[PDB]
Amino acid sequence: SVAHGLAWSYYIGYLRLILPELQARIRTYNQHYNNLLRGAVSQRLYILLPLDCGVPDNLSPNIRFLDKLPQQTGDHAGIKDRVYSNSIYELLENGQRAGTCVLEYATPLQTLFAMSQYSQAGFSREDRLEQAKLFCRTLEDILADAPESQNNCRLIAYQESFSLSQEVLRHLRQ
Amino acid sequence: SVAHGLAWSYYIGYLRLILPELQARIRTYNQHYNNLLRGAVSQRLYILLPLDCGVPDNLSMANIRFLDKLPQQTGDHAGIKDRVYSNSIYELLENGQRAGTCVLEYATPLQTLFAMSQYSQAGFSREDRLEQAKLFCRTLEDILADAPESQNNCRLIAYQESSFSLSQEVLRHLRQE
Numbered sequence A: 001s002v003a004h005g006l007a008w009s010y011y012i013g014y015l016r017l018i019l020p021e022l023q024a025r026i027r028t029y030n031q032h033y034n035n036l037l038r039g040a041v042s043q044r045l046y047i048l049l050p051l052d053c054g055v056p057d058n059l060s061p062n063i064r065f066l067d068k069l070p071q072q073t074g075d076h077a078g079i080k081d082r083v084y085s086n087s088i089y090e091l092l093e094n095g096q097r098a099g100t101c102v103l104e105y106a107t108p109l110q111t112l113f114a115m116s117q118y119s120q121a122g123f124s125r126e127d128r129l130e131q132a133k134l135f136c137r138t139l140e141d142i143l144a145d146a147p148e149s150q151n152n153c154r155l156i157a158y159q160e161s162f163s164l165s166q167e168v169l170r171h172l173r174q
Numbered sequence B: 001s002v003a004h005g006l007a008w009s010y011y012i013g014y015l016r017l018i019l020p021e022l023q024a025r026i027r028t029y030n031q032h033y034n035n036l037l038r039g040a041v042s043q044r045l046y047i048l049l050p051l052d053c054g055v056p057d058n059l060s061m062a063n064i065r066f067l068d069k070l071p072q073q074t075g076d077h078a079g080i081k082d083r084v085y086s087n088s089i090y091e092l093l094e095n096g097q098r099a100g101t102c103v104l105e106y107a108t109p110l111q112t113l114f115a116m117s118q119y120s121q122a123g124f125s126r127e128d129r130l131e132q133a134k135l136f137c138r139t140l141e142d143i144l145a146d147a148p149e150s151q152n153n154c155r156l157i158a159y160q161e162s163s164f165s166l167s168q169e170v171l172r173h174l175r176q177e
């Protein structure tokens, strides 16, 4: 299926590569690049999984972009020093800072949305919802048995006055 | 199907983003005379599509010699600000002498197909892999044929496996202006 391939590519080509190094990158940021009065970046990659596949290019009102982690580079598929970058976000609640975390949308959901938009893909909006859920289930089952493993990332799936900050804060507060 | 999603993934999240800016990046590189004294970088992105899905991480080691990187291109995508896209320049040797210079890379989704055939949890046989790899290439060509970003700035190089010369494979396409 469509979602089966997207989920395995998200793991094979991304999570498997950046999860084993995420802990070292976050500890580097907290010790050197963090401003004096800014909070420790929580561990773990928080992955946003909107089932409607609505992915804005700019995630950054209670979610404010702070900074980027140090880059991770590697050679892949003949591209020398392919760069992997992640963004740190501040989470506001009642005007007060409630958390800071590495946060991003699952990029394959943008592919599912584009396929529903383009007639040549032959892919309906109903197909999109079924495949989005199937993507999330496959990714969870992959991570459950993955050595790089689910303990470096949290999947935040949700369907849609929904508040995205409160959704992430609920996961960030255990 | 598996290949259907990977092809659209390759177009939506990569080719449609870098192909419209590729010509201007190569031109800027060729405008520096110390770069050009090596040899000029040909236009177009040359995409290697081995049907067996054997994709090494280092193509230079695998008559194909890494030269330099093309200046990076950045953009904001899915909440990752200033995501970095990079491409590499290779010179192709023939009888010990440089015969061509081009931007060259494997299609990264073929490594997903390979890894799926390797992992039992994917439920994906080697027969499945060959079928989907051919479906991937056809679906990618049909997308590029109708893509406004267009296939006039990229070349697909599909092949399988006697001595096989990848450098000669690319050189045959590179010499077809």
Ligand SMILES: Nc1nc(=O)c2ncn([C@@H]3O[C@@H]4COP(=O)(O)O[C@@H]5[C@@H](O)[C@H](n6cnc7c(N)ncnc76)O[C@@H]5COP(=O)(O)O[C@@H]3[C@@H]4O)c2[nH]1
Binding pocket: A009, A010, A011, A013, A014, A077, A079, A082, A083, A084, A085, A106, A107, A108, B006, B009, B010, B011, B012, B013, B014, B015, B080, B083, B084, B085, B086, B105, B106, B108, B109, B112
């Ligand atoms: N050669 C090459 N250089 C690149 O910079 C690049 N960036 C993307 N792609 C390929 O285009 C297609 C779609 O791009 P994504 O949705 O962003 O990647 C999807 C995306 O779900 C995720 N991902 C990969 N790199 C990521 C990154 N740097 N940041 C966030 N997510 C990423 O993991 C998938 C597999 O990645 P790749 O298997 O490396 O190949 C991709 C894919 O085939 C690239 N291909």
